[PDB]
Design an enzyme around this catalytic site. Structure first.
Site, PDB file in Angstrom:
ATOM      1  N   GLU A   1      25.860   6.080  -1.935  1.00  0.00           N
ATOM      2  CA  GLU A   1      26.099   7.354  -1.268  1.00  0.00           C
ATOM      3  C   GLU A   1      25.273   7.504   0.002  1.00  0.00           C
ATOM      4  OE1 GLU A   1      26.476  10.391  -4.083  1.00  0.00           O
ATOM      5  OE2 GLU A   1      27.109  11.936  -2.641  1.00  0.00           O
TER       6      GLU A   1
ATOM      7  N   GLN B   1       0.825  -1.204   0.000  1.00  0.00           N
ATOM      8  CA  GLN B   1       0.000   0.000   0.000  1.00  0.00           C
ATOM      9  C   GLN B   1       0.861   1.257   0.000  1.00  0.00           C
ATOM     10  OE1 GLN B   1      -4.172  -1.582   2.091  1.00  0.00           O
ATOM     11  NE2 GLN B   1      -2.746  -0.300   3.258  1.00  0.00           N
TER      12      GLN B   1
HETATM   13  N1  LIG Z   1       1.662   3.195   7.571  1.00  0.00           N
HETATM   14  C1  LIG Z   1       1.029   2.078   7.227  1.00  0.00           C
HETATM   15  N2  LIG Z   1       1.076   0.984   8.062  1.00  0.00           N
HETATM   16  C2  LIG Z   1       0.443  -0.163   7.729  1.00  0.00           C
HETATM   17  C3  LIG Z   1      -0.265  -0.255   6.541  1.00  0.00           C
HETATM   18  N3  LIG Z   1      -0.783  -1.504   6.476  1.00  0.00           N
HETATM   19  C4  LIG Z   1      -0.421  -2.193   7.584  1.00  0.00           C
HETATM   20  N4  LIG Z   1       0.330  -1.368   8.375  1.00  0.00           N
HETATM   21  C5  LIG Z   1       0.960  -1.701   9.664  1.00  0.00           C
HETATM   22  O1  LIG Z   1       1.627  -2.942   9.522  1.00  0.00           O
HETATM   23  C6  LIG Z   1       1.430  -3.747  10.668  1.00  0.00           C
HETATM   24  C7  LIG Z   1       0.667  -5.004  10.268  1.00  0.00           C
HETATM   25  O2  LIG Z   1       1.412  -5.744   9.333  1.00  0.00           O
HETATM   26  P1  LIG Z   1       0.931  -5.950   7.812  1.00  0.00           P
HETATM   27  O3  LIG Z   1       1.849  -5.261   6.829  1.00  0.00           O
HETATM   28  O4  LIG Z   1      -0.493  -5.485   7.641  1.00  0.00           O
HETATM   29  O5  LIG Z   1       1.000  -7.553   7.664  1.00  0.00           O
HETATM   30  P2  LIG Z   1       1.683  -8.274   6.402  1.00  0.00           P
HETATM   31  O6  LIG Z   1       3.061  -7.727   6.116  1.00  0.00           O
HETATM   32  O7  LIG Z   1       0.778  -8.145   5.202  1.00  0.00           O
HETATM   33  O8  LIG Z   1       1.842  -9.825   6.824  1.00  0.00           O
HETATM   34  P3  LIG Z   1       0.617 -10.818   7.186  1.00  0.00           P
HETATM   35  O9  LIG Z   1       0.646 -11.108   8.667  1.00  0.00           O
HETATM   36  O10 LIG Z   1       0.824 -12.100   6.413  1.00  0.00           O
HETATM   37  O11 LIG Z   1      -0.705 -10.195   6.818  1.00  0.00           O
HETATM   38  C8  LIG Z   1       0.618  -2.931  11.649  1.00  0.00           C
HETATM   39  O12 LIG Z   1       1.508  -2.305  12.545  1.00  0.00           O
HETATM   40  C9  LIG Z   1      -0.052  -1.894  10.778  1.00  0.00           C
HETATM   41  O13 LIG Z   1      -0.277  -0.709  11.498  1.00  0.00           O
HETATM   42  C10 LIG Z   1      -0.318   0.843   5.689  1.00  0.00           C
HETATM   43  O14 LIG Z   1      -0.939   0.785   4.627  1.00  0.00           O
HETATM   44  N5  LIG Z   1       0.332   2.011   6.040  1.00  0.00           N
END
Ligand SMILES: Nc1nc2c(ncn2[C@@H]2O[C@H](COP(=O)(O)OP(=O)(O)OP(=O)(O)O)[C@@H](O)[C@H]2O)c(=O)[nH]1
Ligand SMILES: Nc1ncnc2c1ncn2[C@@H]1O[C@H](COP(=O)(O)OP(=O)(O)CP(=O)(O)O)[C@@H](O)[C@H]1O
Ligand SMILES: Nc1nc2c(ncn2[C@@H]2O[C@H](COP(=O)(O)OP(=O)(O)O)[C@@H](O)[C@H]2O)c(=O)[nH]1
Ligand SMILES: CCC(=O)Nc1ccc(C)cc1O
Ligand SMILES: [Ca+2]
Ligand SMILES: [Ca+2]
Ligand SMILES: [Ca+2]
Ligand SMILES: [Mg+2]
Ligand SMILES: [Mg+2]
Ligand SMILES: [Mg+2]
Lengths: 425, 352, 54, 438
Positions: free
Chosen positions: D254, D15
């Site tokens: 760098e 995302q």
């Molecule tokens: N800033 C931001 N943080 C995100 C976003 N999506 C998830 N997070 C953060 O990422 C963490 C959750 O991990 P995810 O990235 O959703 O999980 P994943 O990497 O897809 O791995 P899985 O457990 O298999 O779903 C939490 O701390 C969320 O707040 C996003 O779109 N933007």
């Protein structure tokens, strides 16, 4: 495509399972004939979680109805949404289980389990990606208790890495059919300790007390008790059935709710709970205050007697997501002595825009609390009061069981009680 | 309902504040390791400031300013004064001090000896005092060989500063003394001076021809109550409060405590706290700080005030625990967490 | 306060200001860890099946 | 010209990757269909923007990117989103069931079965590069994929591309926007196994991005969209030097030279200003001094911490918009006389300054306002260790009771990997203190 396979077993299991599909079918806009007639795409976003899509845009629940006698399932087949279920998914015998755990688990049930697994295997082979299973049943009878836990043992053998969830109605002497319910419940609990990832504990005494004291029902019926289970089952599955920023599947929920493998028995709750002053708007503070009140809990356990390992709250309806966070943090920051301080941020909240039928908003409570040991203590005490005199055991030894298996069930649950006790201090 | 945690059981001050907080029925104490708190009464050493202000929805407050150790440490105070332009090296209210590291370990050994040899050559009074923060360990001597050799026998940083050979003496008695001022800085960095001070007097006549006996030279409350034979003779507990001391200044010196002493004290307090404000201010910080300070001053026979040190975890005089601790809850705690005068402090206005 | 290494181009420039001078596992080993963990899973599941066999 | 390949792992990585490539396109004048009218060289060229974009004969400018997720819901938005046309199917890799927030599941159970597929797709992009610089890896600390699979990918990348640099954009876990309880486990597990494989990592604490959105943008309850659009601005400010003509941070190497004198301490603090609400009537445009001075306010740091109580090892100022060197040096002089900027004695006390005349691009209809000048400061402070301490403390709380450990052991991970990872963090915290404290 994260499909769930539903199994309902026995009288209690099929009657509570029936109402469940009735409540959610209305939420997803599915009529008794399986045709959709809603007005929002949110109703179909996650529709395949519980329903299969048939020809002509028909939606057929992914449910398997199991019993050792025809009666209750003839009722379902003739009930409101009886026509909605797949005919081949009815699996039943004629003998019955006589409220006997040994009949459902060892004799009568063993003769029918393979055919139930044939239907389970059928529903699974068609799932693009199966999350896991959910079972509805009581522990005090014979079919849902004995055969239900036999089913779980064989499903875990064929699907060892799928999630196994149950909604388990716990017997209470105040809402009792036979005196052997503590026997059947003690035997089932050990099966659940070993072979379920999550078990929602529903105490019939808590359901009764709520109907009598809160809802003001002079003479509660099993139907009244099942309305509470319906609404509660709809609440705990809202995250699964509708879209939201949570994006949670069964294994994710289990991973954040179960810090220890055997301590996976949950206290569910629901709010509001109002008698017929029923049209009053319920504010977020009121919603939150009730959701955490013991009188809104269906395990008949006082949370102030234990400590919460993890908590999951689901709010439904158009409300102030900002105002929810404030009241949630208020409950925690005003009663932090009942939360274990060695699990940071162990209270999670999730919102959902679609409210249940006939409510502007509502809240469902899911708690992993050590206070649940009170429930297993009651059962254990009632078990021992009879087993010390070997009362009523002949019903079970006549089915090939030995006293030794009872002594081990007794010990298995007193170990479970002790495991909850160590984490309470 | 507000929540707080107690992480310093030895603090007589905040033991009373905690007592008062609970007496309001609106503050609830939690276990010392519970992160969900509004107020932390933290430990003295290694307080984990980094873990504060990261709990969603909780405004968190701590009773220590991170970075104030620069002001409440012997050597640190000297380094702060000599390096900070706001105070400069020509600071007129702080005795000529030097930072001296033991030879078994920058260091101001040669700079000190340069000023020492200058005093010895100019017939001037050349009596210095050696002390450190690791003391209960102090030495007073007029010979530079004794001071340095005393530090090498130790293993921690020491400071040698000019010993005030002409201190103001109270009569009757002919005795030395020091002044303790309590200062409270709130989260907004207002500087409040407790209207009530204390004079820790020496019950022995000041003797300038014998620094070996440190009973008439050190005014510490514990030294007088252990090595002095006239303890509690002139005033209870060798502690004279402002009302008595002010009346003395009027009958003896024809002046007041405000004019002759308090103006210099209020000036020194502002100069020190304003100096380090940008370094320790929590104005735009994710958490909030406040801290109680104990300033120790000296007064010479010319009615000039000198700063001795600053105490970051001070105690209070027994008679003043109730008034001060209550005042702390009012301006430092309830100012952030309100509850459902004639202030006892003197606000020292300044530019932030 | 000295500016050094000034580089200018059509879309910007860059420079360095100095206020004060100063005073792995091979591919074989990664597969072993991936297979060793897969072996502990197989062993744990074998015990689960053995348990269900009893 | 040397190419950079971007890898987005897990939901957060994907995302955030979506928001950056949306911004990259608006900055380079690339349309959703991949066309670029200002690119006079059709189907080729070694311009600065070509480090992030290849070109087809039909004039399509295709991101040098790979999206990887163990479950398809998030990446499906990319396949049907506004910029669906930018990528081709080989670039979007989706499994069917995620790692359930289980590091062991993403790294071992599932990662083992998909790692070779991902490496094959990356190899395809690599074969289009005449001089690959390295990789930018976007992921979260908390997710099971972003943590478990990322560390697996970094280990293999070090094997398949030994001499290539690898930078990280990592999302630090914040409870305000998370329903997972095990994220301290995952974060610490992935930091331990990735540490020796990452040359430079930019940590963004969701707590900081969340508060900036509520404070400066007046968003009462920010969404991932709000968070990601702001995050992609900081990311863009950091990668602009690689995509535009310039002389500072011209190649991934760098970044390590200018920001990481000590290898393990490779986590620079990012600070960005100004962030102004678009719904605002009309804001007074801040000067060079005012935005530079804002770089030393904790409120606009990508990680909440107090630089006043740490030592700096390096400091870059990346300006965009109406900025001339004269103004920068004036503001710097004014700041040194007012701020507490302590450098480590073994590092020069100075600032590397980069200026790009094109002001920050804002997504139409987005939350951010168009400003005439903006700055991102990259500083390597020991003060960022407060973030490691916070995280290690939460880890210690749960691990003392072995809470949730069974979920990891059940996926083939050994319990001893917890303590091995934790002891590494205790050594990392000790390095920071040895460098920053007296
Ligand atoms: N800033 C931001 N943080 C995100 C976003 N999506 C998830 N997070 C953060 O990422 C963490 C959750 O991990 P995810 O990235 O959703 O999980 P994943 O990497 O897809 O791995 P899985 O457990 O298999 O779903 C939490 O701390 C969320 O707040 C996003 O779109 N933007
Ligand atoms: N430069 C100096 N000239 C004269 N007297 C001095 C002095 N430095 C210290 N003293 C004497 O020592 C006493 C204070 O010593 P100091 O404050 O350095 O030790 P300390 O910090 O352990 C006591 P506390 O912290 O409780 O105020 C004062 O009473 C004062 O009389
Ligand atoms: N809540 C609820 N409990 C029930 C219902 N029917 C039976 N029970 C409880 O279930 C237990 C009896 O089990 P039952 O389902 O009738 O036996 P089975 O058909 O062999 O599984 C007793 O504790 C009953 O109180 C019902 O409709 N609702
Ligand atoms: C465990 C209780 C039990 O078996 N009950 C019972 C009673 C009568 C008959 C005919 C069959 C029965 O099963
Ligand atoms: Ca038969
Ligand atoms: Ca071109
Ligand atoms: Ca490498
Ligand atoms: Mg029955
Ligand atoms: Mg002292
Ligand atoms: Mg995911």
């Amino acid at each position: 495509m994260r499909e769930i396979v539903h199994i309902q077993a026995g009288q209690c299991g099929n009657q509570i399972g029936a109402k469940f599909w009735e409540v959610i079918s209305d939420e997803h806009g599915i009529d008794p004939t399986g045709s959709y007639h809603g007005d929002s795409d949110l109703q179909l976003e996650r529709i395949n979680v519980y329903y299969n899509e048939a020809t002509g845009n028909k939606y057929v629940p992914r449910a398997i109805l199991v019993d050792l006698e025809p009666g209750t399932m003839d009722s379902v087949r003739s009930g409101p949404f009886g026509q909605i279920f797949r005919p081949d998914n009815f699996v039943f015998g004629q003998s019955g289980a006589g409220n006997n755990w040994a009949k459902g688990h060892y004799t009568e049930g063993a003769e029918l389990v393979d055919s139930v697994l044939d239907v389970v295997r059928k529903e699974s082979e068609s799932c693009d990606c199966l999350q896991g299973f959910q079972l509805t049943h009581s522990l005090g009878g014979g079919t849902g208790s004995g055969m239900g836990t036999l089913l779980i043992s064989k499903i875990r053998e064929e699907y060892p890495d799928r999630i196994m969830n149950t909604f388990s109605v716990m017997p209470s002497p105040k809402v009792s059919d036979t005196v052997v319910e503590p026997y059947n419940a003690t035997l089932s609990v050990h099966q659940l300790v070993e072979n379920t990832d999550e078990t929602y504990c529903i105490d019939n005494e808590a359901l009764y007390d709520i109907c009598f004291r809160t809802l003001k029902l002079t003479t509660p019926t099993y139907g009244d008790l099942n309305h509470l289970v319906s609404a509660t089952m709809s609440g705990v599955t809202t995250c699964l059935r509708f879209p939201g920023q949570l994006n949670a599947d069964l294994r994710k929920l289990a991973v954040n709710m179960v810090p220890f493998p055997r301590l996976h028995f949950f206290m569910p709750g629901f709010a509001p709970l109002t008698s017929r002053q029923q049209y009053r708007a319920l504010t977020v503070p009121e919603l939150t205050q009730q959701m955490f009140d013991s009188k809104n809990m269906m395990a008949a356990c006082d949370p102030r007697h234990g400590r919460y390992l993890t908590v999951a709250a689901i709010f439904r309806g158009r409300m102030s997501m900002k105002e929810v966070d404030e009241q949630m943090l208020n409950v925690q920051n005003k009663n932090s002595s009942y939360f274990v301080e060695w699990i940071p941020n162990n209270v999670k909240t999730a919102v959902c825009d679609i409210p249940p039928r006939g409510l502007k908003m509502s809240a469902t409570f899911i708690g992993n609390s050590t206070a649940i040991q009170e429930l297993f203590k009651r059962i254990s005490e009632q078990f021992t009061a009879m087993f010390r005199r070997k009362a009523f055991l002949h019903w079970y030894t006549g089915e090939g069981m030995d006293e030794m298996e009872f002594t081990e069930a007794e010990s298995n649950m007193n170990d479970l009680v002790s495991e909850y006790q160590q984490y309470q201090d | 309902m507000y929540t707080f945690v107690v992480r310093d059981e030895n603090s007589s001050v905040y033991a009373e504040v905690s007592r008062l907080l609970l007496a309001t029925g609106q503050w609830k104490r939690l276990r010392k390791d519970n992160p969900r708190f509004n107020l932390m009464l933290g430990e003295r050493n290694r307080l984990p400031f980094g873990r504060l202000g990261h709990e969603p929805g909780l405004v968190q407050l701590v009773n220590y300013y991170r970075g104030a150790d620069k002001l409440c440490r012997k050597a640190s105070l000297v380094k702060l004064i000599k390096t900070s332009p706001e105070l400069s090296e020509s600071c007129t209210w702080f005795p000529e001090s030097y930072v001296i590291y033991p030879t078994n370990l920058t260091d101001e050994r040669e700079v000190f000896l340069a000023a020492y040899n200058r005093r010895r050559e100019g017939r001037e009074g050349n009596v210095w005092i050696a002390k450190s923060s690791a003391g209960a360990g102090i030495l007073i001597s007029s010979e530079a060989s004794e001071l340095l050799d005393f530090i090498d026998e130790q293993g921690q940083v020491h400071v040698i500063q000019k010993y005030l050979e002409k201190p103001l003496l109270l009569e009757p008695g002919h005795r030395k003394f020091d002044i303790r001022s309590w200062v409270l800085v709130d989260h907004l960095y207002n500087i409040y001076l407790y209207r009530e001070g204390v004079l820790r007097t020496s019950s022995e006549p000041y003797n300038s021809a014998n620094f070996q006996d440190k009973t008439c030279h050190l005014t510490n409350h514990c030294i007088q109550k252990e090595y002095s034979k006239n303890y509690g003779r002139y005033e209870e507990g060798n502690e004279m409060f402002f009302e008595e001391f002010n009346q003395y200044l009027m009958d003896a010196l024809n002046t007041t405590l405000e004019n002759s002493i308090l103006l210099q004290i209020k000036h020194i307090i502002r100069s020190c706290l304003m100096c380090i404000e940008p370094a320790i201010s929590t104005k735009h910080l994710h958490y909030q700080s406040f801290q109680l300070f104990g300033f120790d001053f000296m007064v010479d026979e010319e009615l000039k005030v000198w700063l001795i040190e600053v105490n970051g975890a001070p105690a209070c005089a027994q008679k003043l625990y109730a008034e001060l601790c209550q005042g702390i809850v009012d301006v430092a705690i309830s100012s952030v967490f309100p509850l459902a005068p004639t202030s006892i402090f003197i606000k020292l206005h300044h530019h932030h | 306060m000295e500016v050094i290494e000034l580089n200018k181009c059509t879309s910007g420039q860059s420079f360095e200001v100095i206020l004060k001078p100063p005073s792995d596992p091979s591919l074989e080993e990664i597969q072993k860890k991936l297979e060793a963990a897969e072996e502990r899973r197989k062993y744990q599941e074998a015990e689960l099946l053995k348990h269900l066999a009893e | 010209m040397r190419e950079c390949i971007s890898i987005h792992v897990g939901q957060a990585g994907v995302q955030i990757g979506n928001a950056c490539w949306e911004l990259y396109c608006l900055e380079h004048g690339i349309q959703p269909d991949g066309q670029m009218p200002s690119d006079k060289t059709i189907g080729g060229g070694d311009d600065s923007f070509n480090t992030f974009f290849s070109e087809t004969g039909a004039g399509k400018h295709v991101p040098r990117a790979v999206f990887v997720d163990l479950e398809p819901t998030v990446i499906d938005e990319v396949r049907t989103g506004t910029y669906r046309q930018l990528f081709h199917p080989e670039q979007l890799i989706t499994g069917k069931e995620d790692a359930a927030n289980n590091y062991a599941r993403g790294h071992y159970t599932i990662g083992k079965e998909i790692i070779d597929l991902v490496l094959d797709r990356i190899r395809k992009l690599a074969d289009q590069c005449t001089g690959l610089q390295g990789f930018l890896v976007f992921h979260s600390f908390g997710g099971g994929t972003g943590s478990g699979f990322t560390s697996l990918l970094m280990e293999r990348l070090s094997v398949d591309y030994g001499k290539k640099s690898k930078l990280e954009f990592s999302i630090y876990p914040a409870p305000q926007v998370s329903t997972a309880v095990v994220e301290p486990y995952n974060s610490i597990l992935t930091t331990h196994t990735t540490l020796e494989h990452s040359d430079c990592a930019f940590m963004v604490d969701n707590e900081a991005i969340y508060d900036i959105c509520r404070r400066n943008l007046d968003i009462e309850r920010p969404t991932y969209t709000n968070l990601n659009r702001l995050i992609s601005q900081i990311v863009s400010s950091i990668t602009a030097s690689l995509r535009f003509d310039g002389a500072l941070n011209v190649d991934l190497t760098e970044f390590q030279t200018n920001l990481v004198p000590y290898p393990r301490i490779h986590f620079p603090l990012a600070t960005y200003a100004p962030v102004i609400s678009a719904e605002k009537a009309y804001h007074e445009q801040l000067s060079v001094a005012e935005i530079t001075n804002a770089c030393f306010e904790p409120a606009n740091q990508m990680v909440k911490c107090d630089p006043r109580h740490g030592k700096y090892m390096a400091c870059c100022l990346l300006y965009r918009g109406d900025v001339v060197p004269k103004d920068v040096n004036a503001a710097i002089a004014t700041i040194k006389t007012k701020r507490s900027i302590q450098f480590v004695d073994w590092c020069p006390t100075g600032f590397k300054v980069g200026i790009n005349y094109q002001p920050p691009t804002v997504v139409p209809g987005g939350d951010l306002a168009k400003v005439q000048r903006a700055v991102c400061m990259l500083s390597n402070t020991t003060a960022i260790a407060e973030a490691w301490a916070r995280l290690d403390h939460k880890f210690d709380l749960m691990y003392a009771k072995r809470a949730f450990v069974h979920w990891y052991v059940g996926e083939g991970m050994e319990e001893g990997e917890f303590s091995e990872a934790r002891e590494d963090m205790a050594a990392l915290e000790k390095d920071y203190e040895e460098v920053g404290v007296d």
